[PDB]
Amino acid sequence: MKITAVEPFILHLPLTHWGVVGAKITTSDGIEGYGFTGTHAHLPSDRLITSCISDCYAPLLLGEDASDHSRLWTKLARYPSLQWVGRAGITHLALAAVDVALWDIKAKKAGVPLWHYLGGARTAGVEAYNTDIGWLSFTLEDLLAGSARAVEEDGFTRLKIKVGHDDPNIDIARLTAVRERVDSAVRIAIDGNGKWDLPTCQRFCAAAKDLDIYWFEEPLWYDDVTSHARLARNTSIPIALGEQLYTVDAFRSFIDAGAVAYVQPDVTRLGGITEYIQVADLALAHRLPVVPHAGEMSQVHVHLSYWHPASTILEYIPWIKDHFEEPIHVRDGVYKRPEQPGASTTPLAESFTRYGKAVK
Amino acid sequence: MKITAVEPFILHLPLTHWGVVGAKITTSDGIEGYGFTGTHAHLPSDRLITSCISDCYAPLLLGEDASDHSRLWTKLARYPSLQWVGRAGITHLALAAVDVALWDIKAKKAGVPLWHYLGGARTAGVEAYNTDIGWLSFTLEDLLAGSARAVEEDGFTRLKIKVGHDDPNIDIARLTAVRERVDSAVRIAIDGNGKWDLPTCQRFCAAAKDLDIYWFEEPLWYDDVTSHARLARNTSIPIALGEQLYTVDAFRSFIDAGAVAYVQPDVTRLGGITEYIQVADLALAHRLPVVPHAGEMSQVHVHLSYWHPASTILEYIPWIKDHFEEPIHVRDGVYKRPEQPGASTTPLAESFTRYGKAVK
Amino acid sequence: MKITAVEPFILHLPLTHWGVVGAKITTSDGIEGYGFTGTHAHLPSDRLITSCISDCYAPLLLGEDASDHSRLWTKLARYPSLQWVGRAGITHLALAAVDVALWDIKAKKAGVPLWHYLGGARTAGVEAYNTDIGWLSFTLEDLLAGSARAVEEDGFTRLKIKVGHDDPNIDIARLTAVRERVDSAVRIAIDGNGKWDLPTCQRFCAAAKDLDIYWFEEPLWYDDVTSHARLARNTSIPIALGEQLYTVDAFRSFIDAGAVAYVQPDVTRLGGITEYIQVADLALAHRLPVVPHAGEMSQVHVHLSYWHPASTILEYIPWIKDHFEEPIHVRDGVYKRPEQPGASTTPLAESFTRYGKAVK
Amino acid sequence: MKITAVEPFILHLPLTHWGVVGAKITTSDGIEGYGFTGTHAHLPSDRLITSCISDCYAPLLLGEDASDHSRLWTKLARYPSLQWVGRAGITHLALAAVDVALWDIKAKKAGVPLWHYLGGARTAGVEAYNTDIGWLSFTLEDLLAGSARAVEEDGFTRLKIKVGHDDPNIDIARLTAVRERVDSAVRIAIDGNGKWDLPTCQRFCAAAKDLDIYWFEEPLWYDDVTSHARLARNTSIPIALGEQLYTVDAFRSFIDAGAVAYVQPDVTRLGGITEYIQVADLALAHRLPVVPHAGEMSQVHVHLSYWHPASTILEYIPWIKDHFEEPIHVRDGVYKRPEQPGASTTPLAESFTRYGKAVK
Amino acid sequence: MKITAVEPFILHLPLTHWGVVGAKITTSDGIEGYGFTGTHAHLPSDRLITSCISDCYAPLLLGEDASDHSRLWTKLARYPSLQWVGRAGITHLALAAVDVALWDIKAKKAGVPLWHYLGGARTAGVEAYNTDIGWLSFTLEDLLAGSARAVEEDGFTRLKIKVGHDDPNIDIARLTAVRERVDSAVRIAIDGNGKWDLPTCQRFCAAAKDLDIYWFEEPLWYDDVTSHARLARNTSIPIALGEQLYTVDAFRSFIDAGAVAYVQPDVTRLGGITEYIQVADLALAHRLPVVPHAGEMSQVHVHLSYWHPASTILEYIPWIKDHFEEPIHVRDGVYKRPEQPGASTTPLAESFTRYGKAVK
Ligand SMILES: [Cl-]
Ligand SMILES: [Cl-]
Ligand SMILES: [Cl-]
Ligand SMILES: [Cl-]
Ligand SMILES: [Cl-]
């Protein structure tokens, strides 16, 4: 159906805030689709994304058939003046938001949740891992208490804990303490957020040999394929990355080099669901697991991980879920399978009233 | 909707015959989907495929929601007793037929042609190349006359000519004659159908250095990645292959080795549209062109090439088109964009009446 | 001598059953040869193999000199309509059965067991490893009791234990318990049946560093060479595979990549003895050991491992041996050397009466 | 000296227009530095860059010592909320403008042209190549006349001609005609602007074997390293690229892979002069020539090429030079060495009056 | 049957002479097997081989079952004191003679020619190439006359011509003259007998670019794998080698490095038929053609090429054929298929009488 309106929006949601920055696209039948990227919720930079949506993309969308999501992806991504200042960064993040909104429309029009629209479920239950208990800012005391709570009270058996102290031996100590505190059958991944260099990572990985580390996410600088490839060969600890990669080309470079074992596409960083599927298919071809980064707090990725056969487990951070018409939900470490039509990107009406910010 | 019947069929269509061997799948709403593989039309081997469909796959399909095409692909592909004698060959070809039928249903239920269902057109016109004028059995005078007719009367600007004489210099002579006869603006690809070894191909490619060969399809043994990689490095002539590869895994091996430049998935050889899309996405990640082999005489591939953004040109062989509810059609070297709901796999009643063969 | 009859057969033998699916080939002198592949004993899929034998291969065999086993291998394997839907899967499994039957005839006509026909014994005793005590379905209690019995009562000093729980630490625990229970001089190989991905295998292999694992069979997806190559470089635990590979080309890809150390051809998966010997010679060239997978429960492989100089040890599963005219036999962990003319593929006459199933 | 103001500006200069989009930075002593990126001059996208400068970077610059250009590069590039939506694209282009402005200030305060500030001249004369005669839009007669005029009347001995027709043989025809028209001592580089795929490029390069092509710029997709590496090995024609690469990391990937011989950093695409120097030093380490792309129409690059010892020749496009206080000037194919203090980025008042656009 | 005698022999046959140096092995049933290596017919070095046979191998053979050819190969090859001074050279050449004799016995006892014993014919006719017209010692006029006679009078369509002048341009001149004289449909391979170094070969191959050279045999030093690999990548001319390689290990090194395309095992250099088959199987795995070198003047290789499916064409040199009970025979460029029981290694009585030399 024809697109009749494209309206950007900015929500600043409490955890200082997570930025949900995106597009509401309306079609002639009254269906409204939502898509968004994720930000640090600084208004002036959020507005660069919304300005791209309203000022650059909206004119390319109005009057077009929203059903043509593949064709429209290319129309926007390859628009010469925009790709000139793009292929990555703010134009690509704005593209992601539009793309997700178009898929939300497709599934809504079909009257089904996105995982069903795409071809059905590949599992009866997508297992979750809890990231929210693992932030680097936590004292050891608080890291331990939250980890224990997640496992002993909330039924998680998979956690992700941040590392990245200047001296990685501090992280060895923290992880050692967590390993002593929780049951051995708890899986523990770690995440360095690109903080360390190759030699630092080599030493840390050797020192972590007995800690049963599930994966090491973003150990090295985001755009440095070779360091990751060298690290992967130097340790048995699996390397995970993808959060920060904007394109299928970047994923191909990392995957083909053996620089990543756990592939982490993100519809808010790549060009939406469209480019996500391309990367997930690339991972499938290599028989590598797809574990997407929660740039949208898993609101979209729950669908993709219920559907795409290379998927395994799914990141859980509960910050924003209750602000959506269909919150993600985890019970005893398993994601509920979505039921509502669309991609569960639709915020509650009150979310705009309470947390919305002016785009201009 | 629930699957209520699965009926295999065999057509032996004249050009000595082309085998259209597949499945008609009916759902509770009365919609009928068709999918098929392509064979040499020998009844006893055709019946191995249909028996797999009726005796092995039908029990796994009846009562299932046809909408769940992704889940059902896995259910059939990974059924233990079947994959034990599978992963390639008969079982995988039967899987392809089923998968295509499920996608035909999906697009029929949506009321749109498959290319539109998938997200819209990536081009206003898919250019064709004529393979039917180039068979190795043609005398030089007939090769010349047909090549010239296709170009000068029928408006093709792209041809594919078979090679594969025991002495490749005979093929050099034939191609030299065609090049002299037709305008220089005619693109001419060639196809060896896996007939030669590496050294033979090295010599031939060097001898063809001035013939402006667009690509060399299946120069070497189908399962030999390394020979293709070595050939690709030894010549500037691009290598095309894929029509004999059964799995995404095989395509990954060839693509990552630099053993193929023109990637040729085939929904009749891979596991249908489902696996085709995975391979096309893999090619996209490498920025390689997707030019599918006409194992279904382009009835399905016309949709996929109109849609998938890595697609370029499309093989044309006119043998069976007139036996379909929506025949492919090429005018002035360009494929007509399909209009009818479905994947244009539905044959006419006359085809079954005149050319249908008993499956048991 | 001329082939006068080709008759497929299906036996379902108790361990729910193992399928012995093959061909009985009769020559003009009254000699009858037997060859077979192995299946899960599901009648409808077994019949695809027998239908290939009767409907496609028999016409190509009747009247031919059975002595010409090499020429006939090519005649069947490369028959255009069949290789079109082959190179792997059901056509290739049917080929294996025919090939083995032809070799059984050759040795029977010569009046000697196959290992002697081929050129004599390379060892005085082929050592066995017991797989039958190691199934993944066994409780730890039963795994321990059977392992202990095999070693302490039955004289095995080599075992193979299955792994592949979703959490490999469960397999670490099981193997740790077995290692504690049996003497240190017991060799223990493991087998994952392609269940895990690369990062999972890396972690498991590191965690198994002190368990003295003899080899790790099929750790990764069967058609994924690169993951196996990366794993092999990441651990000192040797990688074994081949059970699932249909062709010499696939073996070459794995072997040349350093993706396999223990080479496991199988006459029931490859194209019979003919293709087995090619793969064993390929392994010999690389000075790698040949340890064939018991797809025929070692009835044929006992001959090949007594003869081929790259051979080392031999898998033992006792399910079907007593149904043959010359059962394999293991005493104190050593295979008896076969005595009877042929390839010990001939079932007892009563086996057909008791366990035979109609092919049509 | 302390930064007291940061003012973005947008110029749309006629050649349909070239966008000069940047920042004027004022220090407490009244010195004004100018820096800019280059765009297609579409106001709504230009404003994304200026908004980043005013809304995001200005608060990080005001009150800082402009002398600290290295520290300030890092402060802006790594500001967490900005790098989160950056590392490339809009934020990085805005960073480039700021960085160039700070270097302009540095050289102005020193009272010398930038090439002198940096350490003096590596050559008595930087030779130019004329790009402006070679646009793909030119008819053959106009391509010929302009190429000949540049050489025979204006004293150029180096040209760059666009390629990129759908059929590269049209480009072969055009280049053949130019080669026949002009003296053999004229160097002719070509530029495909990322239009073709690997196989197309292989065929074209082989067809251009006798045309004495100096380099082939951007033959392939900008983010595809492997295709460039494979092409570079397949032809003797040198590959040039860099004008679309945003980071030193991307340049390292291409250079180390042997995917580029002529390295083309651009201060308007990389993070200014600061990052340009890093890339030029990387090229120097590989003994590869540095030939920067004219994203700033060589106003800045004339300094960098006069100075950096890996520099060779310099692109010339005359579109905007007359709008600057110190226009580039080429006589007899040689660039004039800049004389005025600064980086020759200061535009004339008339340019703002006639071609300036409102940023908000 | 038990071996009752082992008698070495030396024949110096005229073409200055070719040395046929080997073993006659008698079994208890009176069957006599013959096998031999090929030498330059210098008596004192020939006697080293015969002394190894009589003094070292005979004691290991007497009383053994000749049927056990595989076991006996190992017994002799690995005898510690012998392998200590072996693995190549004299001991291995003597081993070859013994091995061939045992296979001759095997086929004689079976009452069939060796190609039939091994499993039947892979072709209706093995094509020959004439080497005897191409010796480096021939003047150009004699090279021309003989090449033309072979083609125009004797019906050869395949020739091999020696190269190896100090200045390879003399060889270019000779080959150019032959190419001008004979029809273009004549295939012409060349052979340098290890005379040149890598750079010399690179220049020669480039100079031969238009001479349609079928293969370049032994271009480089026999034990230098890397030079061959580098040459093979530098030219389209195929590299052939193997006639100087003693072991399967050496062949594996060359084949896996891409240093050979035409694989040339020789039963007189490798350890007989036994090792030849291993190498032929290795070549088959790589889909490379097997074209054995005539160290036994094709008396044995005619069988192996009629049988082994990787075989293609066969070298022809007529020097010694008339001295055998079953001479090779070539008519119209095709080898006669052997008919007599055995491996056609049995010499005529006259050969011993006229050309036999005392071994002690
Ligand atoms: Cl996982
Ligand atoms: Cl194309
Ligand atoms: Cl072993
Ligand atoms: Cl230069
Ligand atoms: Cl050949």
From TrEMBL, chains A, B, C, D, E:
UniProtKB keywords: Calcium, Magnesium, Metal-binding
Pfam hit, one: MR_MLE_N
Cofactor: Mg(2+)
Gene Ontology terms describing biological process: carbohydrate catabolic process
Residues covered by the Mandelate racemase/muconate lactonizing enzyme C-terminal domain: 140-238
GO molecular function: hydro-lyase activity; magnesium ion binding
Positions with a binding annotation for Ca(2+): D256, H286
Binding positions for Mg(2+) per the UniProt entry: D191, E217, E243
The protein's name: Mandelate racemase
Origin species: Agrobacterium fabrum (strain C58 / ATCC 33970)
Higher taxonomy: Bacteria, Pseudomonadati, Pseudomonadota, Alphaproteobacteria, Hyphomicrobiales
